[PDB]
């Protein structure tokens, strides 16, 4: 029973040991560094009054949605510092938010175990709820739109699910995690996705048939964030052990470890740039370090927030990055 | 400058801002009480996911977030409740003979809550529930089965006061927060009266720390 599973754990290990002939540092030691990245705050969004927990950009890289704990979903015009919409929420405990690729829908969720879909382009002119999804038993952590008809959600009951907006019922359930699943990331081709959980392990899933393909380990603490590379063949995880790590979907092992001796606090959000050269990680020491993802060097510090950084995200064209924090301020950096 | 439609877009954004501050003072006027501790007895007589109960008493609007249905890890959502006024913590008294010891599991929960980073400034209200059933249980069984260092008489007054002193002994940074201890009465409605009296002292200190006096 258990002895048959234990011997094949080494069968994963020795094939992975023979797979690793070199490291990423031994490949990229002969390239130039990106340099000390200094970038300032261009816009500051001051409308919120509680902690910001989630932020998602738009497809046109101008509108963004921010979720906070006072029960307000606010759509921001980041060019002119305007409030396009203000959506009151049924439950004030919100931990995730999402933006549709078509721009017609937004999502939110949290401790209420309910994912709400709000319609933005209705005839009446006011943002109203379109579909209420409630099939989970654990707290919602991350939700990402695939299109106007299906959405993938992460919950705290060690499961992920694939939904259908029109029917209102889930079509696929992704099971196999043992810890609380904390994040999601959708691939550029939108065929497969990852999920970081609290078992110090992130697993890659297929959207179509609904099975886990690969399992990635290496962290000694629980994972709070995940994000694919812009290539779609790689992703990165941010955990509570002050350590970011990079995985490859083909190599199926660790590549680089982004950590420093003076960093002790955990990581809340991790995102990549447009070219994938810069990894941006939001720590809990009131700042945000910019990690050069091919050199494991801190190439820039974003230290303009009073409280801890909880959410960050980079535009589709790479023009700007917005950082959310618990001091009720969104700051667009460029 | 701006076009004819950008002036109306900024004016629309200003009209939203007067509704955000209107709702901000509406939410800050009401008082939030996190409800921890393993609970259901205290809420039925005063009136999946997080269940919040809204009620008013003496022109003050209370809300109690019952998180007993959350079977997940408490560490990932206990920082969402750092902006509360008082944690209402419920301890049963008739589970000291029942068994891991059920009485000792409450002190492990009490140690984690008081030593949190996010609950240093926030006061904690302590409720000792089922005080009537403890009186019959202390006559048939001594309290020394839980504590081998138990001393004093085995009467109801000495045993109930002996449990209380260790609960306040687990409190650290005693200058910041004050633990209010009450014994629940099922017949009387004095339990909701103790909540209103305890929350009045916290918001006076909260009003005095806004100006800088206390």
């Amino acid at each position: 029973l258990r002895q048959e599973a234990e011997q094949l754990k080494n069968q994963i290990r020795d094939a992975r040991k023979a797979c690793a002939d070199a490291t990423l540092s031994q490949i990229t030691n002969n390239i130039d560094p990106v340099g000390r990245i200094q970038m300032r705050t261009r816009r500051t969004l001051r409308g919120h009054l509680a902690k910001i927990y989630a932020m998602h950009w738009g497809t046109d890289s101008r509108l963004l949605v921010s979720a906070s704990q006072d029960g307000k979903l606010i759509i921001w015009d980041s060019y002119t510092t305007n409030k396009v919409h203000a959506i009151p929420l049924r439950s004030s405990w919100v931990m995730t938010c999402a933006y549709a690729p078509s721009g017609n829908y937004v999502a939110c969720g949290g401790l209420d175990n309910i994912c709400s879909i709000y319609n933005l382009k209705t005839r009446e002119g006011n943002v109203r709820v379109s579909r209420e999804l409630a099939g989970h038993t654990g707290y919602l952590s991350c939700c990402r739109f695939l299109d106007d008809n299906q959405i993938v959600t992460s919950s705290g009951d060690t499961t992920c699910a694939l939904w259908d907006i029109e029917t209102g019922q889930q079509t696929t359930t992704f099971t196999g995690h043992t810890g609380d699943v904390m994040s999601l990331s959708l691939a550029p081709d939108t065929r497969l996705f990852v999920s970081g959980a609290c078992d110090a392990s992130a697993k890659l899933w297929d959207v179509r048939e609904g099975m886990c393909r690969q399992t990635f380990t290496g962290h000694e603490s629980d994972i709070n964030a995940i994000c694919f590379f812009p290539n779609g063949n790689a992703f990165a995880t941010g955990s509570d052990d002050a350590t970011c790590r990079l995985f490859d979907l083909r190599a199926d092992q660790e590549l680089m470890t982004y950590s420093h001796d003076n960093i002790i606090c955990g990581i809340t959000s991790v995102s990549f740039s447009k070219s994938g050269r810069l990894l941006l990680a939001g720590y809990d020491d009131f700042n945000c370090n910019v990690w050069d993802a091919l050199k494991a060097d801190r190439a820039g510090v974003l230290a303009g927030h009073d409280n801890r950084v909880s959410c960050l995200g980079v535009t589709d064209d790479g023009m700007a990055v917005a950082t959310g924090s618990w001091d009720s301020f969104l700051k667009i950096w460029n | 400058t701006l076009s004819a439609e950008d002036k109306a877009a900024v004016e629309r954004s200003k009209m939203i801002d007067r509704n955000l501050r209107e709702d901000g003072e509406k939410a800050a006027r009401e008082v939030k009480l996190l409800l921890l501790g393993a609970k259901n007895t205290i809420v039925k007589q005063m009136k999946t996911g997080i269940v919040e109960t809204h009620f008013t008493f003496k022109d003050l609007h209370f809300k109690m977030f019952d998180v007993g249905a959350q079977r997940s890890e408490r560490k990932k959502w206990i920082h969402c409740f750092e902006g509360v006024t008082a944690i209402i913590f419920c301890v049963a008294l008739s589970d000291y003979d029942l068994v891991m010891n059920r009485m000792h599991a409450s002190m492990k929960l009490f140690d984690s809550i008081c030593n949190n980073k996010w609950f240093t400034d926030t006061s904690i209200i302590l409720f000792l529930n089922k005080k009537d059933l403890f009186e019959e249980k202390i006559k048939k069984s001594p309290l020394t089965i839980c504590y081998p260092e138990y001393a004093g008489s085995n009467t109801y007054e000495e045993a109930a006061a002996y449990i209380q002193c260790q609960f306040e002994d687990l409190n650290k940074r005693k200058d910041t927060k004050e633990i209010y201890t009450h014994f629940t009465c099922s017949t009387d409605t004095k339990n909701v009266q103790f909540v209103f009296d305890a929350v009045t002292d916290v918001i006076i200190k909260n009003n005095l720390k806004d100006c800088g006096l206390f």
Partner: single-chain antibody
């Protein structure tokens, strides 16, 4: 969503009449409102405008002072007060709703319409009437005096369709944009000065009068009118 304008009828030049409309089916307090006047066998004329929450009120220069416009958000009723009436003010009055944010489509709905018995950009139509057989793609030209291209990068020109016997309908609200409920045969392109609307297929519902409107600066001025015939 409908707008039914009350009031109207016979009135002496010395008399004064109050015009009001009933708004239903939409969040009336979030929408800015307009009054647009259509003279008999002439082009459309803009009268007044209220922003959301009665913040900014603008008037046409010909009716400034004599006309008062007000709204009541709990009543969901928009009022126009007319104190001095000439022989020029005998015309049909329409009510238009519009909301202004990023990516918005203002002037998207028009009322049914009641009857009553110096430095402005001038909109001119090069053709008075072009009889078009169905199936032949045509372009309707609108010529402006001042360039409508703004610094933020969007030209403010609006295309309207006057079907015979009904209210105006918004087809295109900005250049390289299309309104909701309009088929894909309507396509528009713009330049610095000259603007055109290029339709491809023609049906019985596409016949009427086409009006180009500007929204760069108050007062808003409409086009002369490009009639189509069958």
């Amino acid at each position: 969503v409908q707008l039914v304008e009350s009031g109207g009828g016979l009135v002496q030049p010395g008399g004064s009449r109050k015009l009001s409309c009933s708004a239903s089916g939409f969040a009336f307090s979030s929408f800015g409102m307009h009054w647009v006047r259509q003279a008999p066998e002439k082009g459309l004329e803009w009268v007044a405008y209220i922003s959301s929450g009665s913040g900014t009120i603008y008037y046409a220069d010909t009716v400034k002072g004599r006309f008062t416009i007000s709204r009541d958000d709990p009543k969901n009723t928009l009022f126009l007060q007319m104190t001095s009436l000439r022989s020029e003010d005998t015309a049909m009055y329409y009510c238009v709703r519009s909301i202004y944010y990023y990516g918005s489509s203002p002037f998207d709905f028009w009322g049914q319409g009641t009857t009553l018995t110096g430095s402005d950009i001038v909109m001119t139509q090069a053709t008075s009437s072009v009889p078009v057989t169905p199936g032949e793609s045509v372009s309707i030209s609108c010529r402006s005096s001042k360039s409508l291209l703004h610094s933020n990068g969007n030209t403010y020109l609006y295309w309207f369709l006057q079907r015979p016997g009904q209210s105006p309908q918004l087809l295109i609200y900005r250049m390289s944009n299309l309104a909701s409920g309009v088929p894909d045969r309507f396509s528009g392109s713009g330049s610095g000065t000259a603007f055109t609307l290029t339709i491809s297929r023609l049906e019985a519902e596409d016949v009427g009068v086409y009006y180009c409107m500007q929204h760069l600066e108050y007062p808003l001025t409409f086009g002369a009118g490009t009639k189509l015939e069958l």
